[PDB]
Design a protein around this ligand. Structure first.
Ligand SMILES: *[C@@H]1O[C@H](CO)[C@@H](O)[C@H](O)[C@H]1NC(C)=O
Ligand SMILES: *[C@@H]1O[C@H](CO)[C@@H](O)[C@H](O)[C@H]1NC(C)=O
Ligand SMILES: *[C@@H]1O[C@H](CO)[C@@H](O)[C@H](O)[C@H]1NC(C)=O
Ligand SMILES: *[C@@H]1O[C@H](CO)[C@@H](O)[C@H](O)[C@H]1NC(C)=O
Ligand SMILES: *[C@@H]1O[C@H](CO)[C@@H](O)[C@H](O)[C@H]1NC(C)=O
Ligand SMILES: [Zn+2]
Lengths: 198, 596
């Protein structure tokens, strides 16, 4: 967690439940990364206890979420002269989404009281549509890449525990030492015993 | 589900789908109005096809959501705007003549040719013709010459088409069941369903007459003043008490009186305020004018501009081979895109215009959070009532001193104030009676009071008893003076110029209390008062989600239009006008005539 905190190339970098540093050397069972691209103004909606299209019908964040969120502008990549129609997003869904739930269906919404029969029209509409990003759009509509990182801890060994800092060693003078988690005090001297390879 | 949420879904779909379609049309429009060429004309057509076609379909499927079964006010207002037919209620056979008459009127009004009799060598048409010459010319015959020629050509060749146009517009409006075309246009100011804010369509006329009656002493005093002062440059041909001629009132139609200050100066030998010399000596660029216009809005109550306006807007005339039409306008393309189209020189007029344009930009972005169909002013007049008050605050001799243009050692004398008041009252005050009289003539023509025969006679005698204008030649009922007008030949209204005139003064006086300012109302300059900017924000950000009366009351505290601020602007001018009108009789007598 150093090429992230130190590099000031990020428009929004916020950690909920943990501090950026200090707690950057405590570890968990698993790391989960969710990555996507939204518009400039939707990056606000990505927070616990938020309402809206992105926060409900596209991706729901639990109120007790613990993790971090990164969001930075991507207008130099996701902007095209003819329009960036590649990104799709949803309006028409019958129920709100659970936390960490996804729906990728293309069902025509039965908004009215008559079966749509799979065709759009009056009271029958397509559920997914595109941004169509343009180079001349404002920051409120410019594309932003957003990634959320979640940490999972259980009754597990938790084998992802960050880098460890080390210092050079001196000899022939009694000192304190932490040899690979072994705390001791005394003189370290060259030896000639035969340790087995393990 | 019920009809309410289905209508909500359709509204959301329309709001999403209209935005991207409108953006390309706006981009094409900016490209043309910035770079004129043959190849950038299909885009208009292309855009003028797609968007346009889309629009009609969104009116085709939007009428199956009756407003009776909806109890939310905002969506009711939205449905009212999108359920209107337009011209599709007319059949195709009757719609192929309305557009034909519109094309004929536009072409004939744009096609001008005024020539002197028995002299086919020289002609001067509209521009650089009629407007330029008969504003600085002291020849009676020359002034009455183009005056008669333009009416004898355009009036003759447009009166029969005007006769058909009146009845066609009445029929197309009655197909929409307002009562006729007059109520068609007077329903723009309609608010219903809100207690204490609802308003009727017919009360507009009487309410306008109310404010009209409370300015007549000023109008009569200035009428006698200008008549007496033009009796000097023109020795005679003017009644001691009577109507001024139509060819001695500045422009052709008498609707603007800016061209009369040359002959009528209150106090002479005293140059007015001029800071353009300071601008040209120390050589500001084309930007710092707009940056000061920027910093004014920054300081008062408003945030500063985004980066897009500073790299996507043309500020200086390009010249060269790339042609650009100079017509200062504010452009809101969409998706957070704002720009200004204008060419600037080093002038004080451009300094004042930059404030107006910046106010328009900041007004457009103010309601950017509203839905797509509510991104507009309260009516067609509040939009110009927002950025125009800046020119009232950008012309005071205190902000110019503060920014370092007007001689920080200047002493403002008792003589310049009345001169400035007359100069700026020749424009705002001198146009209300003629404009509203023209609107009243249009209204009575469309309503049905006046048959087609006694049209000009009533027009010409309203020119006498209301405006105080006499015929330089007795006209018969073969011309059509209204047909030769810009917004009458082409289909536009004139009511917006009246309420706006009273809006720009009504808001100002409110901020004049919010600025803690002391002194005459004309010197009221808002500065360093975040409270005034806060109140301005509290009315700009609403838009069409609330009634216009509510927006007015939020600042002025009135549910109806009032004229008192306009006279509160004009106490020194009124006193000075009555000061030098005590030796001659005030008023006009509608019996004198140049032709007797
Ligand atoms: C203006 O349009 C013409 C097309 O006739 C084009 O050649 C020229 O490059 C354009 N100018 C600019 C500044 O885009
Ligand atoms: C009316 O519609 C607007 C638009 O979404 C909504 O904000 C408002 O809550 C609605 N009115 C009521 C009483 O819910
Ligand atoms: C606008 O004002 C903010 C102060 O909140 C400042 O940081 C920013 O640089 C300003 N931008 C411009 C273009 O002046
Ligand atoms: C306060 O007013 C003075 C004079 O009107 C002006 O020069 C100054 O810029 C104003 N303050 C700010 C912060 O703009
Ligand atoms: C300016 O002062 C003079 C001197 O007393 C006075 O006569 C004049 O009326 C003043 N100006 C106005 C507009 O009253
Ligand atoms: Zn304007």
């Amino acid at each position: 967690y150093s090429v992230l905190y130190n590099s000031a190339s990020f428009s929004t970098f916020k950690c909920y439940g943990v501090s950026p540093t200090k707690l950057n050397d405590l570890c968990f069972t698993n790391v989960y990364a969710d990555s996507f691209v939204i518009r400039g103004d939707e990056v606000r909606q990505i927070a616990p206890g938020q309402t809206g299209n992105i926060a409900d019908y596209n991706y729901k964040l639990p109120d007790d979420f613990t993790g971090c969120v990164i969001a930075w502008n991507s207008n130099k990549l996701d902007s095209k002269v003819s329009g960036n129609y590649n990104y799709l997003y949803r309006l028409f869904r019958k129920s709100n989404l659970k936390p960490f739930e996804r729906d990728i269906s293309t069902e025509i919404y039965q908004a009215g009281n008559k079966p749509c029969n799979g065709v759009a029209g009056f009271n029958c509409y397509f559920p997914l549509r595109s941004y169509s990003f343009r180079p001349t759009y404002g920051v409120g509509h410019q594309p932003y890449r957003v990634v959320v990182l979640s940490f999972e801890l259980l009754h597990a060994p938790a084998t992802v525990c960050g880098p460890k800092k080390s210092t050079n060693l001196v000899k022939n003078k009694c000192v304190n030492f932490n040899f690979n988690g072994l705390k001791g005090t005394g003189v370290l001297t060259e030896s000639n015993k035969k340790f087995l390879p393990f | 589900s019920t009809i309410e949420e289905q209508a909500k879904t359709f509204l959301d779909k329309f709001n999403h789908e209209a935005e991207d379609l409108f953006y390309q049309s706006s981009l094409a429009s900016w490209n043309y109005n910035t770079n004129i060429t043959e190849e950038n004309v299909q885009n208009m057509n292309n855009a003028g096809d797609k968007w346009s076609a889309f629009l009609k379909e969104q009116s085709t499927l939007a009428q199956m959501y009756p407003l009776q079964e909806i109890q939310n006010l905002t969506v009711k207002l939205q449905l009212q705007a999108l359920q209107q037919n337009g011209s599709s209620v007319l059949s195709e056979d009757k719609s192929k003549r309305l557009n034909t008459i519109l094309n004929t009127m536009s072409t004939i009004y744009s096609t001008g040719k005024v020539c002197n009799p028995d002299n086919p060598q020289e002609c001067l048409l509209l521009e650089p013709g009629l407007n330029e010459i008969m504003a600085n010319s002291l020849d009676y015959n020359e002034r009455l010459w183009a005056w008669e020629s333009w009416r004898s050509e355009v009036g003759k060749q447009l009166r029969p088409l005007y006769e058909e146009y009146v009845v066609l517009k009445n029929e197309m409006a009655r197909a929409n069941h307002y009562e006729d075309y007059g109520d068609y246009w007077r329903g723009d100011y309609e608010v219903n369903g809100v207690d204490g804010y609802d308003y009727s369509r017919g009360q507009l006329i009487e309410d306008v007459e109310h404010t009209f009656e409370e300015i007549k002493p000023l109008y009569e005093h200035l009428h006698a003043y200008v008549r007496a002062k033009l009796m000097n440059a023109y020795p005679s041909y003017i009644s001691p008490i009577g109507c001024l001629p139509a060819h001695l009132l500045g422009d052709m139609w008498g609707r603007f009186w800016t061209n009369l200050y040359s002959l009528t100066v209150p106090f002479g030998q005293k140059p007015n305020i001029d800071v353009t010399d300071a601008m040209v000596d120390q050589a500001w660029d084309a930007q710092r004018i707009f940056k000061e216009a920027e910093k004014f809005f920054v300081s008062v109550g408003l945030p500063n501009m985004t980066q897009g306006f500073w790299e996507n807007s043309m500020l200086t005339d390009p010249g060269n081979v790339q042609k650009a039409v100079c017509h200062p306008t504010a452009w809101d393309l969409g998706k957070g895109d704002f720009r200004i189209l204008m060419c600037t020189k080093v002038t004080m007029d451009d300094f004042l215009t930059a404030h107006h344009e910046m106010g328009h930009i900041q007004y457009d972005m103010a309601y950017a959070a509203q839905p797509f169909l509510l991104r507009n002013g309260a009516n067609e007049g509040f939009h110009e009532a927002v950025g125009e008050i800046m020119s009232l605050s950008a012309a005071t001799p205190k902000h110019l001193k503060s920014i370092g243009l007007l001689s920080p050692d200047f002493q403002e004398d008792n003589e310049t104030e009345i001169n400035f008041l007359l100069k700026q009252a020749l424009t705002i005050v001198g146009t209300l009676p003629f404009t509203y009289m023209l609107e009243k003539w249009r209204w009575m023509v469309f309503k049905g009071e006046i048959p087609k025969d006694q049209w000009m006679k009533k027009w010409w005698e309203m020119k006498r008893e209301i405006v105080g204008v006499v015929e330089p030649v007795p006209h018969d009922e073969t011309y059509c003076d209204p047909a030769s007008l810009f917004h009458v030949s082409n289909d536009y209204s004139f009511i917006r110029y009246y309420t706006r005139t009273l809006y720009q003064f009504q808001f100002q006086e409110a901020l004049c209390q919010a600025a803690k300012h002391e002194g005459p109302l004309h010197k009221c300059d808002i500065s360093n008062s975040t409270e005034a900017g806060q109140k301005l924000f509290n009315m700009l950000r609403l838009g069409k989600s609330e009634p216009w009366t509510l927006a007015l009351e939020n600042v002025v505290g009135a549910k109806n239009m009032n004229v008192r601020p306009l006279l509160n602007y004009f106490e020194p001018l009124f006193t000075w006008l009555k000061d030098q009108n005590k030796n001659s009789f005030v008023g006009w007598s509608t019996d004198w005539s140049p032709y007797a």
